């Protein structure tokens, strides 16, 4: 019971918020109404803190172990039991299009149940993204390759994604990883890929399909020669789905790993042990590296919210541990030191570290949840009248901030949940340390920051011309220019957002002097994550602000008990984020116009 | 070598280019330790700590102490103990030990420099070792008698401990409820059980241990001023010659499992449980344990700070030399072809944003704790600074808050910045860092957590200081402004100064206020942490541009080689630092001139 859920938080962003609930109950959700959905979380939440939670500690403390004679790993017991509990529940199928056996939801109401897994033991989600691979290989499949993909999501194979080698990690394209075609339309797969999730899984599944990057024989260079390729780890009746003969594809290492220890981490061995890796075309298109991003997004996403909900567990269960502890006198009686100890909640330090926890926590929710709103065309017109082209832009535009800004904020400010904790904090007997060391790496897989940072900048506002920028910069002003209750905050907001056009206008004028001066290019690579910080920060600032503004008017109408504390709580975070987060930008700002090549031009011997 | 990199170059800079601390080598009370033996000092215990020091770091934390309940012990890895032994062999368990205890006289500026290096390769082999300076502690302290044992545990090498946190008393050390009971002989028996205590039990290390331990005789009044302090050994012995007698009342009964520092036991210390008193001997033969033991904390806190200083240089040294030889992706010019060159990362402007961070604050914070013990002679004070021995005390008082609290959440903050350098592979094992960042997770909490420091900075080193010390060295700093290659940096410490200065005046409002509205005080504590680390922010942009005028100076002399290189940086990371990160120290004022106690007045619930 280390995992503290908050589907109040959902169901008020989801509902309350966004409205997403206009949706339920018509057209592609005929047959899932608000009230299903309300019970869908709560459902998935209680499992959540109960069995999939129950392994959290086992995983770690007690990780895979490797045989290398059989290519295989052994996972903990508890671990598989609370697998196999999650797909008891079909919940490895949420989401899922209905004809592969999917509950049919929005996008934002499967991040939300997603979300209870991820902050419960995250690995276990992973292993159970099979279905949702088999949906992608479908949607880019041939006919025939779709009756693979429908066998696979009703028989819940396992998959992987295989991109990585050891001198192709952020430059994907340089792999080597050779396809070699078979006079039967089949290809053989040649070469050994780095670091691939869930390579091996124990007996969790009857199969695993890996989708691997490979290049044709021949075929150009970088990532536009690379094509993508089904490669099951078991042979199988094409018809039937019945298992065959093993195919050669075998983990040969398993890593060692700061955190997230009972995902096993793989190296992948292709057509190295006198076994030919067989692979089929997906698709049977060369489009590799397109085909693959379809589950780079989803990735993406995923870590994001992975990174999300391990931070609002963190905070939740500081909070409640500084409810509970009892340390020192109240400040206004500091010099009296026979008076009454408190409880912690009562010193300001931990009142500000409390409140900054749950402000990027819940911005942070928001800010995912709100992304998720633009992933279905039908739930973008309903809640935003925007168009599917635009919805997609606008999406393909926060994925860099769910992924890049909500994995750094969250280890950030879980240094704070461990911090309230107080020496205890230390200790592993509290989950905030695992915590810490399993979302490390949210910030590296599927794609690091400064990755994402040049993602964000060139291919989601220079190429998309600066439309999904420009769409959401209208809603930030239009909730601004709109009681006057929220006048500081919405003043502090404008402030954030002159100052985040005004990074985007200088990193613009360094891309353009680029065209006389190759070198000023670099200015923009220096100043591209605190770019992505900063947006990320403003997005913050706004959806908490918006949440204060619902929180007012449900106050206004008369909320009593928990409901009243919760929008209460709701307004002290949208104007403590504003006075003590969003001013930091205008500093930013000025550091960003004022960026030179000194540091570029500077030896490396002086490092 | 070994994950341990040291940097002995930088410390020789520091202390002879710098700060002069060889001006007083060779005369009075160093009249034996000139600057050449110095420096072969350094250069031979950095060779230890890269050798058999860091040889067991990756062993103390993979196999790690186990307590045994048959016999109330902890047993250490083998690889550990000989580690500990390398140390104790070559003495530097005896590095600024008094002479009359069998030390080498040396300047503490030197000895801080010395014990770096262990900290960096092994940081708990430092802890268990710093028993002989505990005995110095005991010696001054004790009564004539007394000084005739702390000798003889001196020169037998004996282990120590203090002995202060409890379950319900941590920060609030005044809280304990401990007990000492006097005895007719006039000893005490002591009465409690102790929570966290580092090094406990030592497996074999040592043939006693001297537990320094807080505890309130029956009768006395309440808080920290009603404690005593107590010598309780592990063993009886023969008060003068030193025979190793009867077992003594104090046990460990448990050791904890941490999220890093795992080498170091840290154990539940029970006295007068087992069916033996603990007896304990009053230090001084007078009740005065919280003065007392605060020559403790104050050894205990700098150690904490270089500890953690220590860890952010080698975290950096290894990403930089990472860095230099991974090759990943082509120049940013050339982004559009993707048949560019392939190039090492330090080419990237995000990696040498990111190196260039490390560097300069790894850098600075040597500075500061170097600066901080040039305060701590009073004939270093004098003669490389000018101040007599009272105000040097107090700057070196209003310094180690800074040491520890701004060391400590700097060195973890930034190690994330050396970690995501590796990329992926940083994650793993493999590489030191993972470690590097769980080992000094805790030193934001032992020896008092952050916000003890800054409540100590401002309430204590500043308040009751009535500014005497913050006054002195902001009169450096603005000398230094006031003295053209430095113009700039000038300008923006200028800036920065003016920005702290504001802060200060803006919290001291806040005290000062309280008189008429008690609630005031509550906005000190809501800025205190804040104003610790602005005040720390403009601490290293000072000393890195001092280092930067004096590479000025000798590159203008003619450096060259390896020379010019090291100038060339300490001239680059100055005008970083001065850019990048003091400008935010604006905002940061402005934040806390806005303060105000909504967090304070909002529901518990609400959270
Ligand atoms: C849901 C199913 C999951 C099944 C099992 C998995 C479960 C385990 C979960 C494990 C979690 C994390 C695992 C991983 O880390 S997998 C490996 C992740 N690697 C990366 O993210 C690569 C990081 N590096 C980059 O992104 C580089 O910037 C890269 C794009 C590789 C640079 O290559 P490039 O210079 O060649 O790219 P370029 O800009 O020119 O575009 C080339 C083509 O790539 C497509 N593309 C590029 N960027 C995007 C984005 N953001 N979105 C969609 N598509 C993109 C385009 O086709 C582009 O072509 P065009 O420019 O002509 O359109
Ligand atoms: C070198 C030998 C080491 C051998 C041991 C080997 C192992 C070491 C390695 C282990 C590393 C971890 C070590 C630890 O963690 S030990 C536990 C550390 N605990 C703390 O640091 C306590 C944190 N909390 C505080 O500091 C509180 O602020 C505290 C002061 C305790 C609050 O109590 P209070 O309200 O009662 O304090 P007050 O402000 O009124 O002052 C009372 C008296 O305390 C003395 N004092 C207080 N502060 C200082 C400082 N900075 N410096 C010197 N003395 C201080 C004063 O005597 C004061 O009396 P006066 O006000 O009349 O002067
Ligand atoms: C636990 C774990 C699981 C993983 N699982 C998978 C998986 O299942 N499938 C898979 O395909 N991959 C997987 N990966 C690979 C992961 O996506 C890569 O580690 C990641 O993209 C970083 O690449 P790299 O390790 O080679 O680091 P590098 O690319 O070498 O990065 C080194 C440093 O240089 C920087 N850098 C590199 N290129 C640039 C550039 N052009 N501009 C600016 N900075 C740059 C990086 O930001 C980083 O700081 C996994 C990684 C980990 C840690
Ligand atoms: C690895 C390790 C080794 C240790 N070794 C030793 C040892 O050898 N000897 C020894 O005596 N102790 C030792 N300690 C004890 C350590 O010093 C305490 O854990 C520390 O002082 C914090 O106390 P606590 O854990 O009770 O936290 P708490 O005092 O309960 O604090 C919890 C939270 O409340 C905050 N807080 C508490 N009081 C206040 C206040 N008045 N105002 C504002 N915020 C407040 C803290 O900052 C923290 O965020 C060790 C601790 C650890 C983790």
Same mark, same amino acid.
């Given at each position: 019971?280390?995992?503290?859920?908050?589907? $109040?938080?959902?169901?008020?962003?989801?509902?309350?918020?966004?409205?997403?609930?206009?949706?339920?109950?018509?057209?592609?959700?005929?047959?899932?109404?608000?009230?299903?959905?309300?019970?869908?979380?709560?459902?998935?939440?209680?499992?959540?803190?109960?069995?999939?939670?129950?392994?959290?500690?086992?995983?770690?403390?007690?990780?895979?172990?490797?045989?290398?004679?059989?290519?295989?790993?052994?996972?903990?017991?508890?671990?598989?039991?609370?697998?196999?509990?999650?797909?008891?529940?079909?919940?490895?199928?949420?989401?899922?299009?209905?004809?592969?056996?999917?509950?049919?939801?929005?996008?934002?109401?499967?991040?939300?149940?997603?979300?209870?897994? *991820?902050?419960?033991?995250? +690995?276990?989600?992973?292993?159970?993204?099979?279905?949702?691979?088999?949906?992608?290989?479908?949607?880019?499949?041939?006919?025939?390759?779709?009756?693979?993909?429908?066998?696979?999501?009703?028989?819940?194979?396992?998959?992987?994604?295989?991109?990585?080698?050891?001198?192709?990690?952020?430059?994907?394209?340089?792999?080597?990883?050779?396809?070699?075609?078979?006079?039967?339309?089949?290809?053989?797969?040649?070469?050994?890929?780095?670091?691939?999730?869930?390579?091996?899984?124990?007996?969790?599944?009857?199969?695993?399909?890996?989708?691997?990057?490979? $290049?044709?024989?021949?075929?150009?260079?970088?990532?536009?020669?690379?094509?993508?390729?089904?490669?099951?780890?078991?042979?199988?009746?094409? /018809?039937?789905?019945?298992?065959?003969?093993?195919?050669?594809?075998?983990?040969?290492?398993?890593?060692?790993?700061?955190?997230?220890?009972?995902?096993?981490?793989?190296?992948?061995?292709?057509?190295?042990?006198?076994?030919?890796?067989?692979?089929? *075309?997906?698709?049977?298109?060369?489009?590799?590296?397109?085909?693959?991003?379809?589950?780079?997004?989803?990735?993406?996403?995923?870590?994001?919210?992975?990174?999300?909900?391990?931070?609002?567990?963190?905070?939740?269960?500081?909070?409640?541990?500084?409810?509970?502890?009892?340390?020192?006198?109240?400040?206004?009686?500091?010099?009296?030191?026979?008076?009454?100890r408190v409880t912690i909640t009562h010193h300001p330090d931990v009142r500000?570290?409390?409140?900054?926890?749950?402000?990027?926590?819940?911005?942070?929710?928001?800010?995912?949840?709100?992304?998720?709103?633009?992933?279905? +065309?039908?739930?973008?017109?309903?809640?935003?009248?925007?168009?599917?082209?635009?919805?997609?832009?606008?999406?393909? *535009?926060? *994925?860099?901030?769910?992924?890049?800004?909500?994995?750094?904020? +969250?280890?950030?400010?879980?240094?704070?949940?461990?911090?309230?904790?107080?020496g205890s904090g230390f200790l592993q007997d509290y989950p905030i340390e695992?915590?810490?060391?399993?979302?490390?790496?949210?910030?590296?897989?599927?794609?690091?920051?400064?990755?994402?940072?040049?993602?964000?900048?060139?291919?989601?506002?220079?190429r998309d011309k600066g439309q999904a920028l420009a769409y959401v910069a209208?809603?930030?002003?239009?909730?601004?220019?709109?009681?006057?209750?929220?006048?500081?905050? $919405?003043?502090?907001?404008?402030?954030?957002?002159?100052?985040?056009?005004?990074?985007?206008?200088?990193?613009?004028?360094?891309?353009?002097?680029?065209?006389?001066?190759?070198?000023?290019?670099?200015?923009?690579?220096?100043?591209?994550?605190?770019?992505?910080?900063?947006?990320?920060?403003?997005?913050?600032?706004?959806?908490?602000?918006?949440?204060?503004?619902?929180?007012? /008017?449900?106050?206004? +109408?008369?909320?009593?008990?928990?409901?009243?504390?919760?929008? /209460?709580?709701?307004?002290?975070?949208?104007?403590?984020?504003?006075?003590?987060?969003?001013?930091?930008?205008?500093?930013?700002?000025?550091?960003?116009?004022?960026?030179?090549?000194?540091?570029?031009?500077?030896?490396?011997?002086?490092?």
């Amino acid at each position: 019971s280390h995992y503290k859920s908050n589907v $109040r938080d959902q169901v008020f962003n989801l509902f309350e918020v966004f409205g997403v609930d206009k949706v339920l109950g018509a057209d592609k959700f005929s047959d899932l109404d608000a009230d299903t959905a309300r019970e869908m979380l709560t459902e998935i939440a209680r499992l959540a803190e109960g069995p999939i939670a129950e392994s959290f500690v086992e995983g770690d403390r007690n990780p895979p172990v490797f045989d290398p004679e059989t290519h295989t790993v052994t996972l903990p017991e508890g671990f598989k039991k609370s697998m196999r509990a999650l797909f008891d529940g079909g919940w490895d199928k949420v989401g899922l299009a209905e004809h592969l056996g999917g509950i049919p939801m929005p996008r934002a109401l499967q991040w939300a149940l997603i979300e209870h897994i *991820l902050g419960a033991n995250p +690995a276990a989600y992973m292993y159970a993204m099979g279905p949702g691979m088999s949906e992608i290989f479908y949607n880019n499949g041939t006919d025939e390759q779709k009756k693979w993909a429908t066998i696979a999501a009703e028989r819940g194979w396992g998959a992987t994604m295989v991109l990585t080698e050891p001198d192709a990690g952020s430059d994907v394209g340089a792999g080597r990883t050779k396809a070699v075609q078979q006079p039967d339309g089949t290809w053989h797969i040649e070469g050994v890929k780095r670091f691939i999730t869930s390579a091996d899984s124990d007996d969790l599944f009857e199969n695993i399909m890996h989708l691997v990057l490979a $290049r044709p024989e021949g075929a150009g260079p970088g990532t536009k020669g690379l094509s993508l390729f089904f490669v099951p780890k078991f042979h199988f009746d094409h /018809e039937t789905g019945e298992i065959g003969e093993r195919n050669g594809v075998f983990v040969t290492n398993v890593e060692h790993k700061m955190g997230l220890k009972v995902s096993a981490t793989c190296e992948l061995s292709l057509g190295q042990h006198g076994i030919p890796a067989v692979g089929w *075309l997906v698709g049977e298109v060369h489009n590799g590296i397109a085909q693959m991003f379809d589950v780079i997004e989803q990735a993406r996403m995923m870590v994001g919210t992975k990174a999300i909900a391990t931070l609002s567990t963190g905070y939740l269960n500081a909070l409640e541990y500084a409810k509970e502890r009892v340390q020192g006198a109240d400040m206004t009686q500091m010099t009296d030191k026979t008076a009454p100890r408190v409880t912690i909640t009562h010193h300001p330090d931990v009142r500000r570290s409390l409140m900054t926890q749950k402000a990027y926590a819940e911005g942070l929710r928001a800010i995912y949840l709100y992304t998720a709103t633009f992933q279905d +065309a039908e739930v973008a017109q309903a809640v935003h009248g925007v168009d599917g082209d635009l919805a997609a832009r606008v999406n393909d *535009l926060l *994925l860099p901030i769910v992924k890049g800004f909500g994995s750094e904020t +969250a280890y950030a400010k879980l240094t704070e949940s461990l911090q309230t904790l107080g020496g205890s904090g230390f200790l592993q007997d509290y989950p905030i340390e695992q915590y810490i060391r399993d979302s490390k790496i949210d910030s590296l897989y599927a794609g690091t920051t400064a990755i994402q940072a040049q993602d964000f900048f060139f291919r989601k506002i220079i190429r998309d011309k600066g439309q999904a920028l420009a769409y959401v910069a209208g809603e930030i002003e239009q909730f601004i220019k709109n009681n006057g209750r929220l006048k500081t905050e $919405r003043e502090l907001l404008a402030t954030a957002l002159a100052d985040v056009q005004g990074m985007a206008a200088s990193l613009t004028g360094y891309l353009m002097a680029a065209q006389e001066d190759a070198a000023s290019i670099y200015k923009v690579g220096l100043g591209s994550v605190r770019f992505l910080m900063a947006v990320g920060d403003l997005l913050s600032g706004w959806l908490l602000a918006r949440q204060a503004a619902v929180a007012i /008017e449900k106050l206004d +109408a008369g909320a009593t008990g928990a409901d009243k504390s919760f929008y /209460e709580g709701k307004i002290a975070a949208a104007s403590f984020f504003a006075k003590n987060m969003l001013p930091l930008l205008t500093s930013t700002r000025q550091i960003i116009e004022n960026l030179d090549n000194d540091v570029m031009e500077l030896d490396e011997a002086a490092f």
